[PDB]
Amino acid sequence: MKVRASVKRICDKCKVIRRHGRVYVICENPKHKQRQG
Ligand SMILES: [Zn+2]
Numbered sequence: 001m002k003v004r005a006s007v008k009r010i011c012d013k014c015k016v017i018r019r020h021g022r023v024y025v026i027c028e029n030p031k032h033k034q035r036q037g
């Protein structure tokens with residue numbers, strides 16, 4: 001899975017996760033819930 005997206009942290013609550021060659025962006029703020037790929 002690959003997409004032209006580079007989910008980066010936005011505020012002091014988002015965290016970039018690392019999984020099967022995949023990445024996620026989870027945060028208390030729902031506006032920062034992103035995921036690479
Ligand atoms: Zn955030």
